[PDB]
Ligand code: HEM
Ligand code: HEM
Ligand SMILES: Cc1cc(N)nc2cc(-c3cccc(CN)c3)c(F)cc12
Ligand SMILES: Cc1cc(N)nc2cc(-c3cccc(CN)c3)c(F)cc12
């Protein structure tokens with residue numbers, strides 16, 4: 001059945017047929033909505049490790065069919081032969097291998113399918129680095145360094161994904177143990193408080209426990225912790241010259257630069273899993289450019305993060321006596337003004353939440369026009385500040401799960417059998 | 420079957436068993452989620468007993484009287500009525516309980532920590548629009564309480580055959596008129612333009628100004644609705660000024676103190692109360708963010724940013740964001756100075772989190788609509804933003820109904 005979505009600010013209605021292709025459960029039922037659960041479902045597509053032939057082949061035949069349908073070649077010579085080819089590979093190795101073209105289509109369509117991503121207007125501009133030949137942590141580190149250098153591009157950032165060998169039996173997983181390629185360290189204090197970034201206290205302590213000598217500051221770039229083919233992970237320090245960083249100053253308040261804050265320029269998620277025709281790529285660092293709110297709202301102001309609202313209000317001469325002065329809201333805007341101004345001053349790519357949300361509505365129209373729909377997750381698309389004065393707030397959205405996709409995966413130290 | 424929700428700021432984990440009690444659809448399916456759709460998707464005898472049995476069993480359970488003599492008698496008494504009359508009548512106790520639980524069950528409402536203190540006015544003896552006006556006037560006075568606002572609902576007879584419905588045509592009991600101009604602009608509140616037209620056509624002579632309190636349009640027993648002017652002295656209003664910007668008062672802005680929604684439908688035990696205006700007090704952002712800053716509303720963001728000298732050339736200045744905060748400060752300060760009840764979005768979200776935990780503890784869950792609970796500004800810095808929530812439809816519930824002018828078949832001339 002068709003389904004309609006409406007924008008209550010413009011009354012534009014869109015009709016969704018794409019959802020008929022959705023594959024995995026969302027977690028919801030007709031009696032219960034789970035649209036604010038972080039991980040609602042666990043509906044995978046095969047047993048975690050090596051499926052049987054009748055379990056893996058259907059998923060592959062699905063993806064190949066879709067890819068050749070994409071390129072106006074359904075049922076053609078290449079398509080029929082490829083099916084037989086994947087049959088014989090599965091028969092002989094219990095898995096199969098993607099062509100380079102199929103790998104790129106797959107990567108680009110996982111992004112296009114990422115319902116939580118406000119940035120997807122860019123989806124077809126992704127640069128894919130094939131690292132499926134990699135065999136060691138050292139090689140993993142080389143591929144990552146090149147990723148970082150390409151994607152940073154001196155501040156004119158470029159979207160990229162690097163794809164390491166697919167999972168095979170689960171014992172031989174490639175993993176980036178860091179959650180992002182570049183994050184700051186968090187240090188548990190003697191008095192019980194925390195220095196650096198609290199999100200990373202546990203990882204930061206794994207690194208120290210692994211032999212990292214922490215400089216023990218507020219903005220200590222963490223080492224890379226890389227796992228190849230199921231071995232114990234290994235530490236690597238990213239060459240500093242490759243880590244672009246922006247000092248936060250404020251266009252008006254000169255005292256702001258004296259708060260001593262900076263953030264890195266490149267967001268690069270490295271703990272997610274990419275899924276293409278039954279194949280699972282457990283290591284696939286991908287990177288873009290920040291929306292300003294990701295730094296200034298969440299990274300700086302969350303309570304279990306940097307928590308600098310506290311101080312920015314003091315230096316602003318604000319009534320911190322009661323909430324109704326809205327001192328939190330007022331500092332929160334100034335901080336985000338500063339992040340945007342600092343990144344733009346240093347000609348480092350960044351997008352504000354007004355431009356980004358506007359782009360996503362344009363993207364949404366585009367998709368409904370040519371594709372029959374566009375999975376979008378209102379809870380994540382709406383920026384965490386000034387929600388209702390952005391155009392996505394008044395936009396109805398359908399959420400559903402298309403493949404290929406990015407998926408979550410457990411932290412490798414919960415499941416790693418050490419050597 | 421249990422179900423868990425996590426707070427990702429505090430790691431508190433609550434366990435929802437109450438969700439098994441729902442039997443109303445959400446519009447979500449197993450493979451699509453519709454949690455951001457505004458509106459997803461009369462009874463015969465056969466349909467009615469089970470709904471009534473459901474509510475009566477629930478009521479006698481709530482008072483530790485389940486299976487009692489008085490419980491079984493009420494059930495049989497209810498059955499008799501649905502046979503003899505095709506409907507039935509709620510007791511006064513049942514009505515109060517139902518009214519309060521509909522509030523308790525309203526998943527989009529962040530102010531439900533107050534649910535048990537609802538003052539219920541039984542207006543089921545009403546027969547005419549003039550009767551309705553009297554009841555509403557006494558609702559407004561009382562709830563307003565000279566600025567010390569008190570929650571209250573007034574409940575009118577209930578639907579019978581669909582033909583003799585009571586309706587308040589107003590969407591709230593106090594709203595400002597809106598006049599579209601020949602040049603395309605709008606005077607007053609753009610949100611109420613259509614209802615303003617309806618009133619004018621019914622005979623209302625508008626002052627055609629910025630803050631005209633609309634007249635009540637009251638329908639009783641399925642008759643044509645009638646106009647009535649709320650007595651001006653019962654409409655408490657707050658002039659909006661700002662504690663720092665002495666120029667803010669020059670915007671000439673004011674709002675009414677009493678938010679009082681009147682277009683919804685109250686469902687208790689299969690009975691439909693199509694007129695049931697209810698009221699509480701404001702969260703600031705309802706006025707400061709959605710009333711004055713929604714582009715389709717009073718839209719004073721441009722004007723406020725002007726008078727702040729902000730750089731309005733590029734969005735990344737965040738002038739919009741900056742002007743929004745100041746309006747919302749001015750709203751809270753204005754109400755607190757005139758000692759009219761109001762809650763800011765921080766305090767309100769903190770209270771709802773306490774309320775939710777308590778309701779999991781004592782009730783086994785608490786249906787909540789994250790898309791509506793999260794304030795429309797500064798979301799991530801309020802605790803609900805990080806709170807996982809399960810959404811499902813318990814009854815009694817408040818429900819949406821179609822606008823009366825889209826379905827009313829007229830009588831006069
Ligand atoms: C190019 C600039 C991009 C911007 C501005 C952007 C923006 C965002 C933001 C703000 C979020 C929510 C993050 C949070 O609040 O925690 C998000 C989610 C996400 N983004 Fe993007 N993104 C960009 C590029 C990319 C690329 C290149 C990929 C992968 C190819 C990607 C994949 C994702 C995924 C998979 C999620 C959510 C996954 C989940 O949790 O289920 N993004 N995006
Ligand atoms: C006393 C203080 C109250 C506060 C602070 C409050 C606050 C709110 C807010 C902010 C909303 C969202 C409105 C929007 O942003 O569009 C809401 C929705 C709602 N409130 Fe409350 N409210 C209060 C009292 C009540 C009472 C007394 C009732 C009924 C007896 C009630 C029933 C509802 C309902 C039914 C909805 C959502 C209706 C829908 O599904 O659209 N509220 N409330
Ligand atoms: C590529 C990219 C860019 C950006 N600017 N932001 C991004 C945010 C996420 C993201 C998704 C879910 C959870 C989290 C936080 N762990 C981040 C992500 F995957 C990729 C992002
Ligand atoms: C009683 C009460 C108090 C308050 N403070 N707020 C309330 C807001 C709504 C409401 C529900 C749906 C949409 C809208 C938007 N006009 C408002 C409502 F029914 C009742 C409210």
Ligand SMILES: C[C@H](O)[C@H](O)[C@H]1CNc2nc(N)[nH]c(=O)c2N1
Nearest residue numbers: 393394395396455456457790791
């Ligand atoms: C499209 C979207 O679902 C819609 O605008 C909703 C979102 N959340 C909301 N939340 C509140 N409090 N009030 C609203 O009107 C809305 N509107």
Ligand SMILES: C[C@H](O)[C@H](O)[C@H]1CNc2nc(N)[nH]c(=O)c2N1
Nearest residue numbers: 036037038379380804805806807
């Ligand atoms: C409980 C809630 O679903 C959770 O905190 C979500 C809400 N929306 C979000 N939205 C974005 N963009 N990023 C997030 O981490 C979250 N967290």
Ligand SMILES: [Zn+2]
Nearest residue numbers: 028033447452
């Ligand atoms: Zn849902």
